[PDB]
Symmetry: D2
Subunit: 492 residues, 4 copies
């Protein structure tokens, strides 16, 4: 009874909070305070900044752990996909305000650093081929709308709305199949660099076809592997073929920011709810991002609509809710994060777990897979015994994942030896990674146990588990290729 529940409306937040680190936050002290607020994954927007502009963050991040461990600080690498950008005005951020006048658009660098009013540049050197008369072109957050009057290349366009034409802004051209590659020559260097410094995840930008992901996979190369690929659905194609994409990727990212530019902004409300849902089904994790608290970028107080977005994104099924420029330059970073976390606590506090689990477990099996079967079965026991926690050890993150899907109204303490897994594990809601240093003991029967009890302790530390409580353990033991198949309902 959605109505009954809704009519009738503490625990530890279970949804990650990705944070884009900018100059103003690029320092252990701050980087720590951010993590103290609730920062988990760290976004690395490679759209701006040099290899040192980032290699500086990767270290400061690692520092924050040193200064104070807390929770396995993750480090993501947001590739600067195939994006277009305008050139530079004649002399610094000018104020040329087009009201509805037409003008030329070149791509021969000749005016790259002098474009103004009677002219303007664009990154896409081949735009003259992809774009044709009639095409609209949004510029800067999709503000200025242009209308290609005629390709003359040097193509002719015409403003539609006012607004001044500034320097180096995004050039979104919806309705045009750009012949650009999701991975550029430079893009790869960033990946090889990321895997070099060991970035846990990579938020691939502007994906369209599965092949795209595939490439990001073979480009990540041998070193990649452990690094998960997060496809960022930014255009229409990443929505059209988002199904075949969803298959290969490791998780998708609701790229609202540029999404709302490609497809009509109001559609992003439906496209989100869908993608986020299409992901929970597949089991792959999903991150909702952009302007989740834009106002907090210049204010310690978020607007009603803002917090609503946060929570709703979560209530939709979002696994991760990230902060962009809100912390990458905002005058209120720690405050933003905090507001998020606080909102996140309530969001997942007004969710329908029992039924939702049914729905999730109903669009399955066919039949399910062994590890998924016990994952579901594991969550099942929770609702029955009313388990205060479900301990699960894993090395590939797989198990704790499938466990997160059938989302339990309790925490999913994942004990592990691997340091990367426990890091990107944050990519899953409800998961609480904990690294085990104690090298294996003697048996895959005493070790796993000592590991299981370990989880119990850490849980007890987090208050997650009271004195004489109840809990479920998830471990495997299949002839040779053991891979989760056991369930253990125990008491604390």
């Amino acid at each position: 009874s959605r109505l009954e529940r809704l009519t009738s409306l503490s625990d530890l937040r279970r949804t990650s909070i990705i944070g884009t680190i900018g100059p103003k936050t690029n320092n252990p002290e701050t980087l720590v305070a951010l993590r103290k607020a609730g920062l988990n994954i760290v976004r690395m927007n490679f759209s701006h900044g040099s290899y040192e502009y980032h290699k500086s963050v990767i270290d400061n991040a690692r520092k924050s752990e040193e200064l104070y461990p807390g929770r396995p600080l993750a480090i993501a690498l947001d590739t600067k996909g195939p994006e277009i950008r305008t050139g530079t005005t004649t002399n610094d951020v000018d104020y040329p305000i087009p009201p509805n006048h037409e003008m030329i658009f070149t791509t021969d660098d000749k005016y790259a650093k002098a474009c103004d009013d009677k002219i303007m540049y664009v990154d896409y050197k081949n735009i003259t081929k992809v774009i044709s008369a009639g095409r609209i072109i949004y510029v800067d957050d999709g503000v200025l709308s242009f209308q290609v009057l005629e390709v003359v290349d040097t193509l002719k366009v015409k403003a539609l709305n006012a607004g001044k034409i500034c320097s180096h802004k995004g050039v979104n051209l919806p309705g045009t199949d750009v012949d650009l590659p999701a991975l550029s020559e430079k893009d790869k260097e960033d990946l090889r660099f990321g895997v070099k410094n060991g970035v846990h995840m990579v938020f691939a930008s502007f994906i369209r076809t599965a092949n795209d992901v595939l490439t990001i996979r073979e480009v990540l190369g041998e070193q990649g592997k452990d690094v998960k690929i997060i496809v960022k659905i930014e255009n229409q194609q990443g929505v059209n073929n988002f199904d075949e994409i969803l298959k290969v990727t490791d998780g998708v990212m609701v790229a609202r920011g540029d999404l709302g530019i490609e497809i009509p902004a109001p559609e992003v409300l439906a496209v989100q709810k869908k993608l986020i849902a299409k992901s929970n089904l597949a089991g792959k994790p999903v991150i909702c991002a952009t302007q989740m608290l834009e106002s907090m970028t210049y204010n310690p107080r978020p607007t009603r609509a803002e917090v609503s977005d946060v929570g709703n994104a979560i209530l939709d099924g979002a696994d991760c809710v990230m902060l962009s420029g809100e912390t990458a330059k905002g005058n209120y970073p720690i405050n933003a994060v905090t507001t998020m976390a606080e909102t996140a606590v309530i969001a997942e506090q007004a969710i329908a777990y029992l039924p939702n689990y049914d729905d999730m477990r109903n669009c399955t099996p066919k039949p399910t897979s062994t590890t998924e079967t016990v994952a579901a079965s594991a969550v099942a026991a929770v609702f029955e015994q009313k388990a205060k926690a479900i301990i699960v050890l894993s090395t590939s993150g797989t198990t704790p994942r499938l466990v997160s899907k059938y989302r339990p109204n309790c925490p999913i303490i994942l004990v592990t030896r691997c340091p990367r897994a426990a890091r990107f594990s944050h990519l899953y809601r409800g998961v609480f990674p904990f690294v085990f240093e104690k090298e294996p003991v003697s048996d895959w029967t005493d070790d796993v146990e000592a590991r299981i009890n370990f989880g119990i302790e850490k849980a007890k530390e987090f208050g997650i588990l009271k004195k004489g409580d109840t809990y479920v353990s998830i471990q495997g033991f299949k002839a040779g290729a053991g891979h989760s198949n056991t369930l253990q309902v125990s008491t604390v």
Copy 2:
């Protein structure tokens, strides 16, 4: 969608078939053929017959196993509770046919062997105190209706319907709180006798209050214990206080035969569906009995209504469907049994398992108990992986019970060392007992395993498990007082 399923309508029968053995069936050869048809539990109506009249069956039964093991033949003891009975006519089964005339009813033995027309006897020596004018009294299958005109004791009554007044028939007096004990002086001797020869279960007759069961419990004494108590709801009181009764008993028995006499026959249709359901909830097993195939008592062909009753009783949730005089004297015993089993296969073939499990698991937990939590969780996995069988070892029958409650669309192979448990285990639908003789090996970790694999073999023997199938194992391992808490999703 009950409609969808119903619109759209092999496996091993999963519902026991209790059989009352009579002279015509009191012989290994026959007793075997009966078991070959599908006979499981063996009813011992102690209403008629001497200690040798029964001690003869207990052995012949044991013989059938010798001649041919098959399936652990169970032996139940149906106590002849506090029932009333008419005396004997003047000279043998006379034909005195009362049309609506009145007559005297005595209790001083003086006419006990000469009662006829102008007189008739009744067992209840104290009936003169419990019954008062206005009370109706049914005689023989509730055929002859009398109407106590006035207590003269020697109480005056009057026929209401025709029918001849035969010798030694049942005297059902609905609407009268008889001061009789559910356990008589002789009744106990039968119990001590049963436990002496080791009767697995006891179908207590004419229960009314919980206390009744309690007594049958302390009377069973030390030797009892392992023997389960099956309360037979025969009057109104066993329905009124059937809730407090349901608490203590080990299972109830829908005593239709005399039920339909106490409460209006048409109500038995609702009282059944309710009790049977109130039992599935409690987890206690339930048996539906009497006239389930009365016609087969004199015919090799059952009436449409008959098979319907069988199946429906099962579809209601019945755990056991027994045969009374149908095999205790019927001219077609093996045929009756067969018809039952065949009907039983279809009945459980048109059941809604997935949803029913939800309903069952929804009127729970609060929270559930550890062994119940894994039982439910166990059944859960089944529906997911589509397990062809669920192996569960237990010594008290408890676990396989709770597993049977959340009823899986697959067999519940129970491996055990105990010989009694595996016998009365038949009292639960879906259960397939299998005794293990191999004394324990070395560890509660290698033994249980060797036991688990044992189950797999027997299952493979029964065809229950194909080559590369899937299955779930249920075992315990709780600090000291281990008692089921582990689940194992494996492949065959």
Copy 3:
């Protein structure tokens, strides 16, 4: 849900009780007492008896109404379809497992015994082949065609004596017999002549069968509804295309359990009965629903269970066969049925069931069905003690019965046949209006609607200040139900 309700378990019975009238019941006085118990439709098994053997019942029935109206006594005509039957013995013989000849040349028709026996199916020699089994008399004697010699050779399988003129059920054989025989038609023309409300067509297999029974009923037919009796396997195989044309089906258990393994009839029933509720067509469950009562005033536990369950499955009608067509306890049987029927429909899940029914629909629904559903909807909301619906074709009160309301469906009508066969629908309570139409299709229908209210008030169905829903039409020209009226009594 189901568990809660089941865990937790007066109104007027809403399920008809068809009754096969036999010599012992062929008399107004009795025929009345039967109706007094709860008899509604009257079965006319044309398998046995001459045109006077029945024309006598049709009148006695009509008499019972005269002696005492009560409830519009219906009269059904059970055709004696393409059934096979054995000949007559030498002079009025227990086979143990011996073989014997089976002829079809009349030569031994009145002398068949042991070393020989007759069968109606003259063409059986063509349809049956070696290996085929043949049940005789209630499916007791099982034979095994050793070889077609015709004059085909068979062999007993079970004991039992071989009596005269019994049924010859040959399961697993596609008989080339017609669902309607030359004589069969005469019975139909006769029935429509005396005006039989419904006809229980016997041994149907294909839709075509029904079609024939339709064009044979002819012009006079029309108003008479066709009830297909599913007795073999084909009436189950093609029961879907059949269900389309027929007006309702009849779970022919008796011979069904002979054609298909008896235990399957438990599933075949539940299915057909359900496949019918969906289609909206009425369904009747029959045979041995109280066989024991045929020789006893007390029914067995299994018996009453069948009655109620049949109802709880979704059955619209539960008939009594030889239980009243010769049984030593007719009125008693009926009574036991009705009483059982009251409880059965007393433990039903109406709100949810309506949802299920209304969920396997629409697509979208039809106007009259749309308001029928909508009508039942209002009931559950206002908790209406009754839903008044006037109709002349029975259609509306039908679609209303489908979405089955936990309340009575008082149908007011002018037509006398409709109000009779209307009993074929559960929950329906027909009431004939004699008052010729007044002046307007707006004052008349009203005077009609209020009429329903009165009769309801008479039956106690409607208390003083109660609530009720009215169903009437008013569509441009071709008006045909589309209006709903939530009112107070």
Copy 4:
């Protein structure tokens, strides 16, 4: 279910868009363009502006209809409840964490600065005590009452300059202020004088509050609906008894997020909005639904999300505050809203939601509610492209809106106020009928019903040969909806 639908994701927007009119929008031309975008109800924030500052809007609004009718432009009156406000600085001051005095004796009212500051609440010295926090201006500056000295001592907690005449929100303090002030009433009497359709009562706490706003609206009031604005904690605590009397509530996020922790407003909303759908009373979600659009033609992802979600929660109305009362992009904001609204209600679960709604009912339902539900029921069945309903009190079209149909609810009416505030209900499309009554309550209602059909046909709402349901009454004397009519176009 939810997963399948969500996995799988034109019609006329069905959710109103209230708009607060400010100087920049106070002109027919603009006021029209706003209505052209999708503006319906018009908010009149009486917090700022003189009786002419508003009497000017009431006319310009009325003008927009003249210039171009379109859709019955509604006019709401947002009372400026018991709000507190700071005084004026010395001559038109950034506290970092320093303490300071707070007076209430007017002496410093026009000179308060740094070492002092004023507050409206003259009795604040009694309600507030040491330890209490006090937010100022959009809840930016947080103070901490060090000690009541009155003239109470406080201390800044955050930076920010201390400007003149800003709001003084003191969460956690039961203010003894009246929901209706001496001046407040004058505004009401004024509103009812110029005929304001609805009144958004501000800062309600107890039912009594509403009651007062009811007897203050007086005789002239009546037709004017009272919309309680839940702004503090008490309007949430006793929001249940309030919900009983009021005509609808307003999720007062803006000040709500100040009283209760901002993150809680996400749960408080979903609850209230839901607690309202149940009661049947309409609900409006407001404040910052597109704050960014106040200075931009492009809304942020979070913004549109809020709009739609607010709708998807069950919101009946989504208003725009300063977004159009001063924003540099008014028409654009409205547009973005409407567009978002179209998709929101396009991804809703109607069939099931109706079930849920109709399941937390009846008990039993009321006659007009019973047919309202029943009416919506038929829609889902026949797949009606529209449901015509005539009413004069708005009641019926309301109860019809509750059980929310996936189709438009064309309400035909004679009353001009009803058809105006009727916008307060989602799915409703008011249409005034000028044609004075004909001769019968049977030909008139009809001519009225067909009228609805035409207007519907005009809006494209109804295709050629479509299907539709009509809702009308006819109960003995006190007729008040009880009839349903499933018809074809």
